[PDB]
Every structure is written in structure tokens, then in C-alpha cells.
Amino acid sequence: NVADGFAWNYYFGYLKLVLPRLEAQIAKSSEFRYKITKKKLYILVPKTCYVYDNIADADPRVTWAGDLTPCKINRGGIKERIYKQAVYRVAMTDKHEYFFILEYASNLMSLYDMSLHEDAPLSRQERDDQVVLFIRKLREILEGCKECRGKCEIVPISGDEKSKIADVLVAIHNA
Amino acid sequence: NVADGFAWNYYFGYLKLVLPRLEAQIAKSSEFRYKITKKKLYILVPKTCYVYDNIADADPRVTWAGDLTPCKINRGGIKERIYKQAVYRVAMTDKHEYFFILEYASNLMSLYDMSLHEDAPLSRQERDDQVVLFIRKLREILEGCKECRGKCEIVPISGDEKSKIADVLVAIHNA
Numbered sequence: 483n484v485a486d487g488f489a490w491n492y493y494f495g496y497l498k499l500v501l502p503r504l505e506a507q508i509a510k511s512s513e514f515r516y517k518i519t520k521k522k523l524y525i526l527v528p529k530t531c532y533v534y535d536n537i538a539d540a541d542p543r544v545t546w547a548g549d550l551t552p553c554k555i556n557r558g559g560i561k562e563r564i565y566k567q568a569v570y571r572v573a574m575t576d577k578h579e580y581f582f583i584l585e586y587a588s589n590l591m592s593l594y595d596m597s598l599h600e601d602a603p604l605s606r607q608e609r610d611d612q613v614v615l616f617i618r619k620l621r622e623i624l625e626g627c628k629e630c631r632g633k634c635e636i637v638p639i640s641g642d643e644k645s646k647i648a649d650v651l652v653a654i655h656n657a
Numbered sequence: 658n659v660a661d662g663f664a665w666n667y668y669f670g671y672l673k674l675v676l677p678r679l680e681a682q683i684a685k686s687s688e689f690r691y692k693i694t695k696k697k698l699y700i701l702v703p704k705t706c707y708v709y710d711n712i713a714d715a716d717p718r719v720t721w722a723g724d725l726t727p728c729k730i731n732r733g734g735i736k737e738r739i740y741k742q743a744v745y746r747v748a749m750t751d752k753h754e755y756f757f758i759l760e761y762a763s764n765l766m767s768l769y770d771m772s773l774h775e776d777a778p779l780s781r782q783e784r785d786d787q788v789v790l791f792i793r794k795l796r797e798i799l800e801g802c803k804e805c806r807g808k809c810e811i812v813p814i815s816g817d818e819k820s821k822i823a824d825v826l827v828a829i830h831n832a
């Protein structure tokens with residue numbers, strides 16, 4: 483399944499690079515080192531494959547707050563390729579605010595684009611199926627990785643949970 | 658074929674973002690705005706799927722010279738994700754000196770790591786087959802894209818051609 487390649491590539495090409503470094507990148511963040519309590523990356527996976535470039539456009543309670551210190555890695559001929567995470571602020575009631583290291587699995591944007599291309603390499607139904615398999619395979623990879631296990635949460639978001647991202651994140655935080 | 662996903666993803670997730678911006682990013686570069694004469698990106702594809710992080714380790718004539726002006730693009734929740742190309746100096750026996758925007762198709766590193774993993778979802782022999790299909794599919798995709806067609810070159814490199822990277826680049830430049 484094409485989902486298998488996307489899951490393995492998100493692991494080897496991103497999570498395996500950034501997750502073993504995650505606590506150190508947080509410790510270097512003067513703004514966020516003490517505002518992020520659980521040192522974990524939250525990865526949104528939309529079942530619809532609808533990735534939002536600004537997560538506040540999906541749920542306005544989830545607003546971009548800042549960058550973590552970027553990783554700089556020599557990779558594929560690029561000296562000091564920049565790997566950058568985002569911190570989002572979540573406020574559900576007026577009583578508590580939360581700061582999450584948060585992003586979409588952005589390679590899924592290519593699955594969306596594939597299903598729209600003129601030659602139709604992927605139907606919309608096939609795309610939905612592959613997102614399900616992507617979640618399953620990525621979780622299986624992470625569960626077997628000693629360097630990455632426990633440092634990230636895969637968060638599937640259904641189409642009718644678009645405006646509920648804040649609720650889901652705060653619930654998981656309070657597990 | 659898993660190679661189809663890698664080809665579509667390298668196109669939609671990278672080339673379609675950076676190639677329309679490449680001319681402006683070359684023009685903004687203080688070091689290379691005049692040294693890069695043809696405004697295009699050369700993509701190395703190793704048939705072995707073995708990517709060198711320093712291309713000079715394969716062909717000593719091809720040395721890292723600097724960064725191009727990086728693109729900043731909001732992407733999947735990341736504000737101003739950084740997309741950076743690399744410029745390589747190529748020095749031949751004629752004493753002629755060239756500067757190329759050059760990189761590996763870096764998602765192929767994941768395909769290599771897949772073939773080596775304890776739970777390898779593909780064999781080393783299937784990896785070879787998949788790199789061939791990646792080249793073919795990426796060519797077909799780029800074939801049909803007006804904004805990207807003239808702005809990049811796919812450069813397959815076999816194991817016994819590692820030390821001939823400079824020859825191929827300079828030959829294509831003089832096509």
C-alpha cells in the first residue's frame with residue numbers, strides 16, 4: 483500500500499531525526515522550556531486528508547504561539563537543512579491555557595494532491611483508505627522504536643472533529 | 658508500487674513549492690545571483706539508493722559552495738517552514754568553473770533505510786526496482802508540469818558512476 487511508504491518516510495525522514503532531540507530543543511527554548519509540560523510532539527492526522535496550513539483555520543481555539551529552536555542537519559547534500567516544529571496555544575475555557583508542540587503529518591498533503599491530479603492516480607475513496615493504513619503503520623513503527631516511543635502522539639481527526647481539535651488535545655493531555 | 662508515492666510526494670511536497678520560486682531565490686542570493694547561469698535544480702538519484710550527505714564524498718570535483726536564499730512557506734501548521742537548496746562548485750580539468758543547484762532526492766534515504774530495517778517491508782532487490790520506477794514516474798510527472806518542466810533535471814547515478822557526477826552535470830549544462 484502507498485500508505486506504507488508515507489508512514490516509513492515520515493518516520494525515517496522526520497520523526498527519527500527530531501524526536502530523539504526533542505527535549506534538548508525544548509530546553510533551548512527560552513520562551514517555551516517551562517510552558518510545555520509533557521515533552522511530546524502531537525501529530526494531527528486528518529481522516530479526510532484535509533491539512534490546514536494554519537491550524538487555527540480548523541479550530542480557532544488552537545493558535546500558533548512560536549517556534550522551537552530548529553534542528554540543523556546535513557542531509558541529502560543540503561548543509562544544515564532546517565527542521566522546525568511549531569508550538570500552539572490552546573485555550574478552551576478562560577481558566578487554563580496549554581502549549582503543545584503540534585503539527586500535521588504534512589506528507590499527507592501529497593496524497594490529497596494525488597487524488598486531484600488530472601491523471602487520477604488515487605480516488606478519493608482510496609485516499610481515505612490509505613490514511614487509515616498510514617495511521618496504523620506509523621503507530622506500529624513508533625511502538626517498536628526505542629528512541630521515539632513515548633515522545634509523540636498520533637492524533638487522528640475526523641471530518642466532524644475539525645472544530646474539536648482543542649478538545650481532543652486537552653483530553654489527551656489530561657489522560 | 659511504493660515508488661509512485663515517493664515520486665508524487667517529492668513533486669507535490671517539494672518541487673512544486675520550490676521550482677516556481679527558484680528564479681527569485683537565485684536572484685536574491687548575494688553570492689550566486691550571477692554564478693548560476695541556467696536557473697534550474699539538478700536532482701541526483703542514486704540507483705543504489707545510497708545518498709551521500711556530502712556529494713564531494715562521491716566525486717571530489719563537486720564541492721559544497723553555499724546555500725541559496727531559503728524559501729519560507731507556511732506548511733501543515735508550521736509557520737515559515739524553511740526550504741533550502743544547496744549550491745555546488747564543480748571544477749574540471751580545463752580549469753573551467755561551474756556552480757550548480759544540486760541535491761539528492763532525499764526521501765530516497767527512507768527507501769534505503771526501509772530495505773535495511775529489522776522488519777524490512779522490501780528487499781534490497783526490490784529497492785533497486787523501486788528506484789528505477791521512481792525515476793520513470795518523476796520524469797512523467799514533471800513532463801506534464803508547465804511551471805516545473807524546464808526548471809529541473811533528474812540525474813540518475815549508478816554505483817560505478819559515483820565519480821562521474823561532475824562529468825554528467827557539465828555535459829547536461831552544455832546540452
Ligand SMILES: Nc1nc2c(ncn2[C@@H]2O[C@@H]3COP(=O)(O)O[C@H]4[C@@H](O)[C@H](n5cnc6c(N)ncnc65)O[C@@H]4COP(=O)(O)O[C@H]3[C@H]2O)c(=O)[nH]1
Pocket residue numbers: 491492494495496560563564565566567585587588589590592666667669670671735738739740741742762763764765767
Ligand atoms: N514539521 C516538519 N516536517 C518535515 C520537515 N522536513 C520533512 N518533514 C516531513 O517528513 C516528510 C519526508 O521528509 P523527507 O525529507 O524524507 O523528503 C522530503 C524531501 O525529499 C523534500 N523536501 C521537503 N523539504 C525539503 C527541504 N527543506 N530540503 C530538501 N528537500 C526537501 O520533499 C520531500 C517530502 O516533503 P514533505 O513535506 O512532503 O514530507 C516530509 C515532512 O512531512 C521539517 O522541517 N518540519
